[PDB]
Structure 1
Amino acid sequence: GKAFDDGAFTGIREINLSYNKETAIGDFQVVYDLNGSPYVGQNHKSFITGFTPVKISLDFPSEYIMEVSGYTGNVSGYVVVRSLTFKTNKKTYGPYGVTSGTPFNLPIENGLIVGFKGSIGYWLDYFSMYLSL
């Protein structure tokens, strides 16, 4: 994969990812907030194409993510994030992708996702999240 690191911001306005039912999560791009202004994140794209895009447009600032979850599993020899789900105080978005493999979830009692990092190759290999008050 190519490693990426957005760094930390003020909050999240919008998530653009893509997925394929057959396989896994492909691309990932976040529109962050930065001191009350949108800041368009780097678009982190798969080595391959053919994915179905989605846009998760949050009602910022009153809408925020409370839990990220998904599944990891093996696609054509690659251990990757095969689906993602984003739960806010308002709604659930997803699951996007194949919901088979090993589960993971990050639930949040207090604080905000302010940043994403990871690695994307043919699919999303892994990711981490920056957390702040």
Structure 2
Amino acid sequence: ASQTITVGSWGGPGGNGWDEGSYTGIRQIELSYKEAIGSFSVIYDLNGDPFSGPKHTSKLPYKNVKIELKFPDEFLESVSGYTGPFSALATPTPVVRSLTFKTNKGRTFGPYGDEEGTYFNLPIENGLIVGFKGRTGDLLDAIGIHMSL
């Protein structure tokens, strides 16, 4: 059962949890958004071959946005974002409001969602995101991370 350093779960206790597992790099991430994040589904590298990760969708009519990254030369060095309660769909428990991804090759996949909430930032000085874990239900309640060197 090898393991991996898992960091956080930023977000809230609501929703059903999911854990995609660990895999060898990331190739594209897909997510929907409007005033908070909804659908989130990643395509990873599984030993050089793309592996479709499990899809965590929010039926909300939010806007879809694909994040293709030039792997293996480019990869994530930072993930930051906001957590806060969301009245429109009626839930007192925190949700991730906005997520912002940044890569080693200087590109920032600009703020997706509303930047309202309590700030979460995860800068990486050495190490690599190798998998995603978190809670979906109606939209993205929480998000955490698997890492490796």
Same fold (TM over 0.5): yes
How far apart are 1:83 and its partner, in Å? Answer: 0.3
Residue 50 of structure 1: SS of its match in structure 2?
coil
How far apart are 1:63 and its partner, in Å? Answer: 0.6
Aligned residue in 1 for 2:7: none
Aligned residue in 1 for 2:100: 85
Distance 1:101 1:84 in 2: 11
How far apart are 1:127 and its partner, in Å? Answer: 1.2
How far apart are 1:74 and its partner, in Å? Answer: 1.1
Q: State TM-score, norm by structure 2.
A: 0.84
Distance 1:100 1:128 in 2: 19
- 1:50 corresponds to 2:65: no
AA at the equivalent of 1:111: G
Pick aligned residue for 1:72 from 83, 88, 94: 83
Higher RCO (Cα < 8 Å, 6 or more apart)? 2
Distance 1:123 1:43 in 2: 12
CA RMSD for the aligned pairs?
0.9
What's the CA shift string for 1:90-128, capped at 9, x where partnerless?
A: 200020000011100100000100000110122211111
What's the CA shift string for 1:53-78, capped at 9, x where partnerless?
A: 00000001101000000011110124
Aligned residue in 1 for 2:38: 26
How far apart are 1:45 and its partner, in Å? Answer: 1.1
Distance 1:84 1:132 in 2: 22
AA at the equivalent of 1:3: G
Distance 1:123 1:94 in 2: 20
Q: Which stretches in structure 2 are left out of the alignment for 5+ residues? A: 1-14
Aligned-residue identity in percent: 59
Distance 2:121 2:115 in 1: 13
Residue 100 of structure 1: SS of its match in structure 2?
coil
Runs in 1 of length 4+ with deviation above 3 angstroms? none
- 1:132 corresponds to 2:148: yes
Aligned residue in 1 for 2:10: none
Residue 119 of structure 1: SS of its match in structure 2?
strand
AA at the equivalent of 1:62: D
Aligned residue in 2 for 1:99: 115
Q: Which stretches in structure 1 are left out of the alignment for 5+ residues? A: none
